[PDB]
Curated annotation (Swiss-Prot), chain A:
NCBIfam families: sigma70-ECF. Disruption phenotype: For single rpoE mutant increased sensitivity to singlet oxygen when carotenoid levels are low. For double rpoE-chrR deletion mutant no effect on anaerobic photosynthetic growth. In illuminated aerobically growing cells single and double deletion is bacteriostatic. This is ECF RNA polymerase sigma factor RpoE. SUPFAM superfamilies: Sigma2 domain of RNA polymerase sigma factors, Sigma3 and sigma4 domains of RNA polymerase sigma factors. Interacts transiently with the RNA polymerase catalytic core formed by RpoA, RpoB, RpoC and RpoZ (2 alpha, 1 beta, 1 beta' and 1 omega subunit) to form the RNA polymerase holoenzyme that can initiate transcription. Forms a 1:1 complex (via sigma-70 factor domain 4) with anti-sigma factor ChrR; this inhibits the interaction of RpoE with the RNA polymerase catalytic core. It comes from Cereibacter sphaeroides (strain ATCC 17023 / DSM 158 / JCM 6121 / CCUG 31486 / LMG 2827 / NBRC 12203 / NCIMB 8253 / ATH 2.4.1.) (Rhodobacter sphaeroides). The gene is rpoE.
Curated annotation (Swiss-Prot), chain B:
The gene is chrR. It comes from Cereibacter sphaeroides (strain ATCC 17023 / DSM 158 / JCM 6121 / CCUG 31486 / LMG 2827 / NBRC 12203 / NCIMB 8253 / ATH 2.4.1.) (Rhodobacter sphaeroides). This is Anti-sigma-E factor ChrR. GO terms for molecular function: DNA binding; metal ion binding. Residues 75-182 are annotated as: Required for response to singlet oxygen. Changing C34S: Loss of function; no effect on zinc binding. Changing C175S: No effect on zinc binding. Changing H30A: No effect on anti-sigma function. Anti-sigma factor that inhibits the activity of the extracytoplasmic function (ECF) sigma-E factor (RpoE), thereby indirectly regulating the transcription of the cycA and rpoE genes. ECF sigma factors are held in an inactive form by a cognate anti-sigma factor.
Amino acid sequence: SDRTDWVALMRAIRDHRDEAAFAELFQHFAPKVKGFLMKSGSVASQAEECAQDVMATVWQKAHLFDPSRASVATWIFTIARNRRIDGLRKDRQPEPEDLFWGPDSEPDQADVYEMQQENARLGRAIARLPEAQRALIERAFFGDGLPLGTIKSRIRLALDRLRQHM
Amino acid sequence: TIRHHVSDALLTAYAAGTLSEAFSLVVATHLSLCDECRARAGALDAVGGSLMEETAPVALSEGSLASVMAQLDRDPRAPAPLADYVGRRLEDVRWRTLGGGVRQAILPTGGEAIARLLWIPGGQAVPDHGHRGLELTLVLQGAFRDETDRFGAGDIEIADQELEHTPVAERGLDCICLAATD
Ligand SMILES: [Zn+2]
């Protein structure tokens, strides 16, 4: 499904301010960002508030998305968690220096294809965990041995490339 | 070569976003100085993106998409975010004078953990106490010797309460660090 080809749609926004593409993304990720934030302990109304904000940011920072280092859902997760957390911050989680490909270039189709592959592998592993290890994971990302090795390795690899270009 | 990184537990907290602004400041400054830890955070973020994608969706009030679409628009040793808490260069921050040649400049943050820039000249040492919680230190210039190891530009130390502190800064250049305590 090309309407579901998240990576492709992100490039649509990056290069053509393709609003349909954005709608395509929004209709899929917004509700997930909401449900996610609620599992995190937010009230519906405040979740929907953040969801919308996260999606608006997806549009503004569209150029910062690098399909060779993360899936779109991971990037979006990145924007959801970096929101304001009162008892922990004034504005937003301080985040590291922005490393992005300028309009002149883009990561190798291969590096992208692989990044997405290893990611899909992590997804799969995550899904089949017996309900006990799956909770260990959730408790961490909500309040409080996975193949991260492979994913860690690709990013490390993809990151070096980005460096030679700059 | 950075040989001291952020613990997996601190990287998981940063990726979960449950960290207090201060600690997030140190962890992320390291991340923008150390590609190794940057790749680690990424794998951890991947776990989040997956939980994300596998979460039962919750509908937004009608008109939400239309609503949002309406409002859519068509110093080399202080860089990650740290640069936002300090002005143009490190020579002109609000420096207090302390025990000899050590100087400190507290950084403004939310949360209940404190961040500050410590300025320690070659040869003197940072006097220190084994805190109640966790202390994070990131060398931005020069270096300093704990005995259990050394810490140069970009390296990060993670003290724990079980500790004994003894750090004397290397002679050569002034060792400037970024610290955060809870
Ligand atoms: Zn590191």
